[PDB]
Amino acid sequence: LDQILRATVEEVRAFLGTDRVKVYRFDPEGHGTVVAEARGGERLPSLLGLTFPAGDIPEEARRLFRLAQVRVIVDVEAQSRSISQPESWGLSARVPLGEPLQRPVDPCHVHYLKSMGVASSLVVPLMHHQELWGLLVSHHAEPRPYSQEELQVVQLLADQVSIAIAQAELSL
């Protein structure tokens, strides 16, 4: 699995040429590990082999990853603002899909990325419909907005990858 993913992040990155693209596996406890990381160069430190703090993924958001497989952070310049204080939640039948087009992100995570030297982050999961094995995230040091064309690229590869991680798991 590791070898496959590592090969996936390196090759895919070459196509996106994005400052940094990595795969993030989710552990039932929340302790996920970087099993795939690509970088343009020694410009941005490598987070490979490092462990992220458990709980990095909130509650309302993580549930969306399982429901809509669609998340992205907008240019910090436009300064999207949000509050970690949501009103109730949707029902099983209802599937909330970013009511607004600006889907503002609370400041806590925005400045967090600023600390990472990132302005806009895109997320295109590499997993199943009702089950999340991991998450893919791309970093672009530009205030430019996200385009559907970007989705076209990962849509075909992500689906083939999400399948790879699923098929590879059977080995063990």
Ligand X SMILES: *[C@@H](C)[C@H]1/C(=C/c2[nH]c(/C=C3N=C(/C=C4\NC(=O)C(CC)=C4C)C(C)=C\3CCC(=O)O)c(CCC(=O)O)c2C)NC(=O)[C@H]1C
Residue 109 lies near ligand X (rule: CB under 6 A): yes
Among 95, 108, 156, 163, binds ligand X (CB under 6 A): 108
- 81 annotated to a ligand binding site: yes
Tell which residue, 162, 168, 89, 91, has the closest CA to residue 131. 162
Among 12, 135, 157, 158, binds ligand X (CB under 6 A): 135
* Helix 2-16 × helix 148-171 angle, to 10°: 170
User: In 10 A of CB 51, how many CB atoms?
Assistant: 11
Q: Is 64 exposed, middle or buried (0-12, 13-18, 19+ CB in 10 A)?
A: middle
State which residue has the least CB distance to ligand X. 108
Minimum CB distance to ligand X smaller for 50 or for 167: 50
- Residue 49's contacts (CB-CB under 8 Å, 6 or more residues apart) are 33, 34
Minimum distance of ligand X from residue 111's CB (angstroms):
9
| Phi-psi category of residue 6: left, alpha or beta, with phi > 0 → left and psi -120 to 50 → alpha | alpha
Residue 146 lies near ligand X (rule: CB under 6 A): no
Residue 63 lies near ligand X (rule: CB under 6 A): no
Minimum distance of ligand X from residue 170's CB (angstroms):
25
DSSP state of 124: -
Among 27, 60, 77, 169, binds ligand X (CB under 6 A): 60
> Would the CA dihedral through 62, 108, 40, 150 be positive or negative?
positive
- Tokens 């204080």 belong to 85
| x/- map, 70-89, ligand X, by CB under 6 A | -xxx--------x-x-----
**Binding site residues, ligand X, CB under 6 A:** 24, 52, 56-58, 60-61, 71-73, 82, 84, 105-106, 108-109, 121, 123, 135, 137
Residue ranges of the binding site for (2R,3E)-phycocyanobilin: 24, 56, 71, 81, 106, 108-109
